[PDB]
Design a protein around this ligand. Structure first.
Ligand SMILES: [Mg+2]
Ligand SMILES: [Mg+2]
Ligand SMILES: [Mg+2]
Ligand SMILES: [Mg+2]
Ligand SMILES: [Mg+2]
Length: 1032
RNA sequence: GGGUGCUAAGAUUAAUCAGGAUGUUUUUGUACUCGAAAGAAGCUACAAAGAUAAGGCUUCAUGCCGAAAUC
DNA sequence: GCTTCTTTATCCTGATTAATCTTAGCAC
DNA sequence: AAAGAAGC
């Protein structure tokens, strides 16, 4: 090509390694690590989950706001201030079934029913009220001992049952009350039972939201998943065709038929021979690949035909125009009256839409007015439901338009698609990623593109841009072993489905009716087959009759919880009874089994799992690992995204170096080659630091021009002492506001004297959720040994503390530690609060004075006698000032929670008044000059004035509000400090704990902000502006 | 040998929507403790009602936005 | 003031669209 | 991982 320099890229989810070198000389021209922690984009799972949770709560709250207006307009209640909140609504929901209720009694019964409306895929009040009476509790997920055994209940009931009940209640009230109109009953049942459709989403005509049906643009779709249909591989503004469309069925077969080799004089079929094979299968009612190959065996010996698509086992495959044949079995319609485009569109709607309303609305809106009658669409919706397996197979990679350009050529040429398409025929990173919905893959892509752009303008274009790719070379033996594993996987499902059918019907296939609204049945049945038809936490057998007809009773548990592992694979999944998944909670089977009331023992499972031959190896490893794993310790999704991001860029480059015709070669390397060259070559990848990314990339760049002094020189320059300390680093700064603001925990406070306090102080409460776990007793003892007066029971109920709790710690085992409280309960059941008659309630939790309230967010109810707070408030940015008078620096701290939505405007901002506020509390003189703002991962040089010493750090935040001008810093060259690292004299060693927290408000110290381009070229930025930037 | 295209499967995962049951905390009621009661205490449990990222929107409702990306 | 060290909410049900790797069968 | 009060 033009010049002599080859760039290498090692693209990851949070880093892209960079490296340039002369193909000829072997000199290394540039080395670089670009870092942008993926942790922030994977947070979007946190982001979706909370957004959806916010909508369920909003609508549950609105369900009772809606019921308020219903009650006013009916004239039943106007004044909602004297409504009592201490009646028993569950007793009124059973009383109103036969006897009259007060208008306010009725409001209480309906309001309570609306707050828990049940699932929707003896009335419940009666069952609830009797759980209240015999067990003293209704809600949640609790244990009950019956006839010697322990069972588990939950407050889950079907919405249809709440509907039946409310209908009976309001009807008998209608006997007694004349204001209970039929419209009142109807509109309440809408509030009660009303659900939005999954293909509509949020909003209404007035409330436009681009999350749902009624868009901000003014358009209102029929199905919000229509706009997510992929686009054509070649005509990129055309949507793709349904796999059940005619155009797709014709193209698929045609391309199949031109891919076989026949004994004909051409070795390939003719235009005429094709046309009646199409005509043959299109008019034959029964059809499969075998019957088809039996017929061109007639149209010419079947075993002499070659080139057919193969099955996992080997039972050859070919297209059959299956969708068209079974559509032709419609009676109210004919599948032949319709031209090409009205059958392709019928496939579009029947593929996308899955329910009556979605189908019925699409046909009206996208077919001419008189194209279908009520009985005709009646059959189509029954036809679609009876054939969800055919219309759930998705969408072709091609649009209809492109296939129309190809289809006649496939009739004519005997060429297959590819040879047909060939015969006829800087990068904008934002447009490249405009329609990729994976913020992790999308970000690593833009980071990689933005690097090559900057690499060209500082170095001109390249001869080669090399990209490491996570792909596999395999020889014959490995390959066979893959498809045997892939075969055993499909064999296992069919074996499971067959065993499911025999034990349900006796027949060998299961009716389609069972899979409606339970599309996941196949995988559940597969798990059910792996587990020997047994729930591995309770030990009860699971019968497909319950699994299909009472499918509520079961849930698919993540063995090692997703909160901790993020393992969504089949090996991290079992099918268990619902109540056992719930009690297991966020725990492994090991952590949870023996603690569960309605469950096996862990030894009985340790038995069954290895006595079992159906369970996977990986699945057994997960079911039994005694590892106290948790959320804060030191996955597959990361590999998916590396390949996705690496591929997207690689293709986006070779497209760029073709269409604009610069012809920079674009090559590729695998990890198996680089990782072993690293072993064969010298480079020793060092510990826990970002240097290895730049070296990874250079090894990538070298692996290409390896077909060749210079081979020597390059590896010399690589393994040299003066190399690792010459690598440059550039981090992506995070300036985004309105991130997660604090911890989720809602903390109570009390006034008390603790330790060396003789004036009352405000204390934040903690709570031991369950004293009967060892983690609960462990926490108990730490507090007990340090200060028993911390437990509020010690202070406000000393009878229980010294007459009930203290004796237990005397008379119970404690040891392999064990929990004395749990032993007691194995004896007497739940520790009861002290009383004279044995009357007291049970004890599960103990709250304690924890720490003094410091920095917080105030969420105190107007109700409350004590403040309620959120804590661990997260920072946004730090504004650095200097004060000429004192000579010292003054660092202000901004947090996400300091910005808010301004009421009148709706804008998200901080006002100058409150900003100038934070200025005074932080110790910043009003007559000091702003200098530069610091955001996350901005770099800083901290220069010592006393000595000549200086050091470069990267910023994390302004830390510890009480200690003014205190900031926490992270290293320039790696992720974290180990602890005790030497710094400049004035700052001293970083704390041995690991966190570098230092106050920068001293007298002899110079600090400058530093920026880098994405290549690691830094430039000092001593002053930024006159005033802090606050534009919103 | 890499790259890529059509198809089918196997294995992973991403985006988005509709829902359930909790958990946290406030207040009240009841039980428990104290008091002769009224009550007190706010521990401990159940229930209900309110709040549930701080906080906002307008179109009064199957109402809408608020933890990603934009650097 | 400087360092240490405790602390940190979740389990599911139903659905659609998309991507990546790996086997296959054809092909520039 | 990092907030920030506890601890000295
Ligand atoms: Mg689970
Ligand atoms: Mg705790
Ligand atoms: Mg009281
Ligand atoms: Mg935190
Ligand atoms: Mg603390």
């Amino acid at each position: 090509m033009g010049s002599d320099l080859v760039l290498g890229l090692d693209i990851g989810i949070g880093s892209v390694g960079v490296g340039i070198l002369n193909k000829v000389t072997g000199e290394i021209i540039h080395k670089n690590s670009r870092i942008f922690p993926a942790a922030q984009a994977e947070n979007n799972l946190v982001r979706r989950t909370n957004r959806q949770g916010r909508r369920l709560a909003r609508r549950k709250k609105h369900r009772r706001v809606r019921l308020n207006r219903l009650f006013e307009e009916s004239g039943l209640i106007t004044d909602f201030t004297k409504i009592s909140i201490n009646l028993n609504p569950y007793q009124l929901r059973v009383k109103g079934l036969t006897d009259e209720l007060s208008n306010e009694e009725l409001f209480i019964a309906l309001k309570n029913m609306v707050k828990h409306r049940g699932i929707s895929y003896k009335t419940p009040g009666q069952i609830q009220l009797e759980r209240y009476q015999t067990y003293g509790q209704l809600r949640g997920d609790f244990t009950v001992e019956k006839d010697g055994k322990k069972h588990r209940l939950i407050n889950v009931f079907p919405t249809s049952a709440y509907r039946s009940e409310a209908l009976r209640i309001l009807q008998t009230q209608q006997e007694f009350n004349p204001q209970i109109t039929d419209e009142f009953i109807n509109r309440y049942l809408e509030i009660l039972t009303g659900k939005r459709k999954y293909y509509h989403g949020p909003g209404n005509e007035k409330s436009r939201t681009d999350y749902g049906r009624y868009r901000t643009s003014g358009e209102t779709l029929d199905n919000i998943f229509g706009i997510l249909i992929g686009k054509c591989t070649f005509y990129p503004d055309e949507f793709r065709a349904a796999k059940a469309s005619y155009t797709a069925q014709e193209f698929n077969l045609l391309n199949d038929l031109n891919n076989l080799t026949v004994p004909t004089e051409t070795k390939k079929l003719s235009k005429e021979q094709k046309n009646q094979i199409i005509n043959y299968v299109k008019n034959e009612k029964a059809m499969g690949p075998a019957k088809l190959f039996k017929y061109i065996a007639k149209l010419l010996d079947v075993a002499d035909i070659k080139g057919y698509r193969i099955d996992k086992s080997g039972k050859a495959e070919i297209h059959t125009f299956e969708a068209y044949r079974k559509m032709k079995t419609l009676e109210t319609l004919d599948i032949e009256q319709m031209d090409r485009e009205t059958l392709d569109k019928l496939a579009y709607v029947l593929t996308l839409n899955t329910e009556r309303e979605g189908i019925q609305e699409a046909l009206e809106h996208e077919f001419a007015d008189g194209s279908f009658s009520q009985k005709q669409v009646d059959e189509l919706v029954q036809f679609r439901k009876a054939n969800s397996s055919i219309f759930g197979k998705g969408w072709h990679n091609f649009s209809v338009k492109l296939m129309m350009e190809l289809i006649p050529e496939l009739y004519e040429t005997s060429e297959e698609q590819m040879t047909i398409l060939t015969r006829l025929g800087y990068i904008d990173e934002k447009l490249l990623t405009e329609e990729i919905y994976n913020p992790v893959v999308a970000k690593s892509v833009r980071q990689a593109i933005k690097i090559v752009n900057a690499a060209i303008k500082e170095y001109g274009d390249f001869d080669n841009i090399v990209i490491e790719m996570a792909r596999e070379t395999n020889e014959d033996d490995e390959k066979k072993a893959i498809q045997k594993i892939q075969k055993a996987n499909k064999d296992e499902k069919d074996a499971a489905m067959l065993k499911a059918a025999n034990q349900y019907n006796g027949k060998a296939e299961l009716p389609h009716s069972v899979f409606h609204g339970h599309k996941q049945l196949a995988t559940k049945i597969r798990l059910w087959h792996q587990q020997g038809e047994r729930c591995l936490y309770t030990g009860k057998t699971i019968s497909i009759h319950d699994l299909i007809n009472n499918s509520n009773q079961f849930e698919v548990d993540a063995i090692l919880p997703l909160s901790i592992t993020f393992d969504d694979s089949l090996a991290n999944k079992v099918l268990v009874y619902a109540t056992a998944n719930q009690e297991k909670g966020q725990r492994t089977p090991y952590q949870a089994l023996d603690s569960m009331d309605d469950a096996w023992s862990f030894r009985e499972l340790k038995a069954f799992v290895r006595e079992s031959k159906t369970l996977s190896n990986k699945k057994k490893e997960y079911l039994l690992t005694e590892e106290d794993i948790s959320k804060f310790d030191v996955i597959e999704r990361n590999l998916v995204d590396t390949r996705y991001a690496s591929r997207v860029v690689l293709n986006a480059l070779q497209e760029h170096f073709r269409a604009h015709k610069i012809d920079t070669k674009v090559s590729v390397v695998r990890g198996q080659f680089t990782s072993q060259l690293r072993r064969h070559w010298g480079i020793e990848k060092t510990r826990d630091t970002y240097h290895h990314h730049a070296v990874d990339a250079l090894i990538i760049a070298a692996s290409s021009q390896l077909n060749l002094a210079p081979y020597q020189h390059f590896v010399d320059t690589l393994k040299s002492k003066e190399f690792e300390d010459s690598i440059l680093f550039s981090y992506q700064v995070d300036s985004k506001f309105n991130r997660k603001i604090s911890d989720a925990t809602i903390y109570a406070t009390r006034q008390a004297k603790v330790g060396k306090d003789k004036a009352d102080e405000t204390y934040v409460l903690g709570k031991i959720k369950d004293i009967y776990t060892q983690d609960g007793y462990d926490a108990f003892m730490k507090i007990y040994k340090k200060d028993k007066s911390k437990f509020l029971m010690y202070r406000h109920d000393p009878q229980t503390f010294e007459k009930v709790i203290e004796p237990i710690l005397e008379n119970y085992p404690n040891k392999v530690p064990c929990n004395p409280f749990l032993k007691y309960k194995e004896e007497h059941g739940y520790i009861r609060k002290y009383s004279k008659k044995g009357n007291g309630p049970e004890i599960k939790s103990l709250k304690y004075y924890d720490s003094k309230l410091g920095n917080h967010i105030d969420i105190t109810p107007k109700d409350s006698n004590n403040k309620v707070v959120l804590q661990s408030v997260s920072p946004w940015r730090a504004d650095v000032y200097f004060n000429k008078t004192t000579g010292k620096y003054e660092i202000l701290g901004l947090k996400y929670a300091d910005l808010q939505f301004e009421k009148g405007t709706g804008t998200y901002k901080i006002s100058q008044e409150k900003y100038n506020d934070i200025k005074k509390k932080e110790g910043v003189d009003s007559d000091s000059e702003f200098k530069f703002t610091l955001y996350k991962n901005d770099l800083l040089l901290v220069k010592d004035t006393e000595t000549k010493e200086q050091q470069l750090f990267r910023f994390l935040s302004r830390t510890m509000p009480k200690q003014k001008h205190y900031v926490e810093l992270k290293p320039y060259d790696k992720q974290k400090f180990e602890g005790g690292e030497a710094l400049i004299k004035v700052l001293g060693n970083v704390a041995n704990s690991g966190q570098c927290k230092k106050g920068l408000g001293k007298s002899n110290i110079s600090i400058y902000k530093v920026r880098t381009d994405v290549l690691g070229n830094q430039h000092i930025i001593k002053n930024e502006g006159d005033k802090p930037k606050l534009d919103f």
